Write a protein that binds this ligand. Structure first.
Ligand SMILES: *[C@@H]1O[C@H](CO)[C@@H](O)[C@H](O)[C@H]1NC(C)=O
Ligand SMILES: *[C@@H]1O[C@H](CO)[C@@H](O)[C@H](O)[C@H]1NC(C)=O
Ligand SMILES: CN1CCC[C@H]1c1cncc(F)c1
Ligand SMILES: CN1CCC[C@H]1c1cncc(F)c1
Ligand SMILES: CN1CCC[C@H]1c1cncc(F)c1
Ligand SMILES: CN1CCC[C@H]1c1cncc(F)c1
Ligand SMILES: CN1CCC[C@H]1c1cncc(F)c1
Lengths: 202, 207, 208, 199, 205
């Protein structure tokens, strides 16, 4: 139903505060992050650099966006410029994230938001072992760039489902674990997810 | 060529157009047609399984709320796509952004049919095995909505495919053997719902 | 008239008038005739030539002219012309059909508007084309053809109308120009029942 | 949350992003510190380095301060809502490519912290990268258009990537003042000396 | 005085017409341009192409911007979007000018504007001689892209003794001479565009 959709969008834009974190109660916003690797385009064992493509499945809640969907759309697509989005960054990225897909999020009637862009990006990590049976394991650390743990908490197979069958590489395993970083710059602590990409030449 | 009519039609389109809302009529998905007309193959990396291609992405759909009586006014106008809803199509196996080489205008017809046909340069990760053999390489490109499931958006091939190579450059060092563009459906771990795509199979070889 | 061209308040008023009456998204068809667009490519440099891939990298000044009589003003005592950001004007939606890269505009995106309604837009463009590079090393040279036309307006809406470019081409190029010729064409495409006009620019050139 | 929204609205009511936040007829004291993360490419024939670093930048605008006794201490703010120093690297030969979200932190006392991850290429002396004492690459950073009476600039094993082909021996960052041909006044700058070598 | 600054910026934005040439009386705008070379990055003797970095020192007046500064700041930095800037282009440039510095101009209380971006750009020019002792002489013409001489005059700055003063010692090249002179180009039609012709005499070290 189109008018319903347009009304939901209007509602979302009236209540959405894109530059403000949506803390519910005084708890931090829980953001779920899962990288789905699609391809591995270039590897350099010499420089320890990696060029990759992945779907960054990112979800969280803003209960204030919720509506009653008994007689209306459960979900709509929304431009992320209308929404708050976690300021995630990869601490070992050496190129800026090149978003390859339309910048739309899904908002579910319960206030859940799913943003899943396809990103091409290059990293500085441990490429040693590529041409080995065991293969290399390359570790990507992703976290909020400016919100510490009291403001944002970050939580998280072989990706047979998504990985290209045409890549000069294959994935042996991927694991994602929660992890904390604290830096000389800032007293408050930051949460990251450590994504371990275990892969080898095909 | 009545200009003031063109200006009024544009006014009405922008009054009516909701660029961020899918134009569903009744309770039926928006029926989007996509077809890739191939113009060039620029680079083919046998090492890495990548191809850089140029194609006109013929995209059509209807938004009957935009329609107008054209018995004594212009049948069609050109419109900037930022005034229009445009389907959120993406190539699921692309490895670069789609580079639009042409003016980002769509044609809106008086019955509310919309035609957007950019020329795109884009790189894909696909099977490049066989490119220098007689029977050639076959690269597969999947195009579908990035965020709308099939209850929301249907995507189908266009009726005419016989023109898929008609505009391919005779100066390309590659030549096209066959193209097929066929309906397919994709489901995933993330989302319980299904997405429609047109799978394009591009069979080509080095001259 | 000349004697009033540098009247600043007059220039600002002309700009105001243009922005009031300009419809940047609506083609300026006068009476019931197509907008007559004149296109002339003035080649400046041939940068990269590849005889294998049949690709050429070039720089040219794209002299584009057309008229919109609604922009017109009486200049017998005010500026004859002004510079205008093209984002304030309607501009033909020209595209080069055999381009294989985005046209990189290298100059300020300003057009000239003349008091009689004429609009003159001439960007410096760098762009890569897919065209015929065979024979670039011979005496008679290669002939690279570039096809330029409106991307979405057919012939009833926009019509297109078109030397050795001695005057413009870089003396320091590795290549030289024999001839540049430009012919009108009209074509119907598989997508659409109507016919689109284009210009074919034949760039006859050789390695020095 | 509502308190966050209101602080942000106050910041945007009082912030003049194109006006330097001078207090008391004193220049804005900007403190800079580069935390090198990666050395990506060293071209010995052209004397060019490609590097990734965290540009820790801080200053105060006390007209942004609020009473935090019963509201948050800090928020994140888009830098387009804030004045930021117009720092530039004088020996840069590419645009700064900002790799991170363009958010600053604003602290309830009016302190602003902006720390982008930046990838940029520099013209500097890479002679010696294949020696044990290494090469020393000097990066000169300062305000591009604000002289000393307007802006003053004042000055990595934990940060530097272990996977880099390179290794840092020593980073030093020293104040410097200069007077240029265009203009009578003097501009302050920080000279960042990066001593590094190939493993 | 910060408030004074915000007021000056407000006055400038009340008065400045960013798209209209600031002709004073009935005369052309006098723009002064000078390139201070910082670097020469790549040079190709076959293709006759150079890649250079330079500060594009640009100045002109808009008296309507002027204000009394006896008890207020004599200078402010303004974003160039708030100002009219001349539409300069290098007639033999073969890439877009990559601005490397913050896009801020200085406005001085007497109405003088200084805009001086650091630009990286590639040109087509005579690279023959670059490996000989006498070196190559590459010529760059800079002028208004759309304003003829009766609207904008382009002249060198008074000072060009400093053209190579900030040149990188770590360049694989070196500059022997720089000359920056008045020129006029004319084409079909009677209008002439004034330009500054920069002759860069350089060689490989
Ligand atoms: C323009 O103005 C002059 C008066 O200065 C008048 O004589 C002339 O007829 C006008 N032109 C038109 C077309 O109205
Ligand atoms: C801060 O607010 C608290 C109560 O909200 C009050 O006790 C205190 O006096 C205030 N301090 C300042 C500096 O305004
Ligand atoms: C600790 N955060 C995460 C990485 C860098 C650092 C940071 C960046 N911008 C503003 C901050 F307050 C802190
Ligand atoms: C006439 N153009 C040239 C090829 C395709 C066709 C076209 C492109 N976009 C919108 C159209 F209506 C038509
Ligand atoms: C259905 N799309 C195709 C790929 C992934 C999935 C998707 C992408 N972005 C947001 C979604 F909700 C779903
Ligand atoms: C100074 N340029 C060089 C050629 C002519 C002149 C020019 C360029 N673009 C638009 C014009 F109106 C004039
Ligand atoms: C301090 N910068 C370095 C070069 C010149 C000076 C500068 C740059 N832009 C505008 C100025 F006013 C001054």
């Amino acid at each position: 139903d189109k008018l319903d959709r347009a009304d939901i969008l209007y509602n979302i834009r009236q209540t959405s505060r894109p530059d403000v974190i949506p803390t519910q109660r005084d708890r931090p916003v829980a953001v779920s992050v899962s990288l789905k690797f699609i391809n591995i385009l270039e590897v350099n064992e010499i420089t320890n650099e990696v060029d990759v493509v992945f779907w960054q499945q990112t979800t969280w809640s803003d209960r204030t966006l919720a509506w009653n969907s008994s007689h209306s759309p459960d979900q709509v697509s929304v431009p992320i410029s209308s929404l708050w989005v976690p300021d995630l960054a990869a601490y070992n990225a050496i190129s800026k994230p090149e978003v390859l897909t339309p910048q739309l999020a899904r908002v579910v009637s319960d206030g859940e938001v799913l943003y899943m862009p396809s990103i091409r990006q290059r990293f500085s990590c441990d490429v040693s072992g590529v041409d080995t049976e065991s293969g290399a394991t390359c570790r990507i650390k992703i976290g909020s760039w400016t919100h510490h743990s009291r403001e944002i908490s970050v939580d998280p197979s072989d990706d047979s489902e998504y990985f290209s069958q045409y890549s000069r590489f294959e994935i042996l395993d991927v694991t994602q674990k929660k992890n904390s970083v604290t830096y000389s710059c800032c007293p408050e602590a930051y949460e990251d997810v450590e994504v371990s990409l275990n892969f080898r030449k095909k």
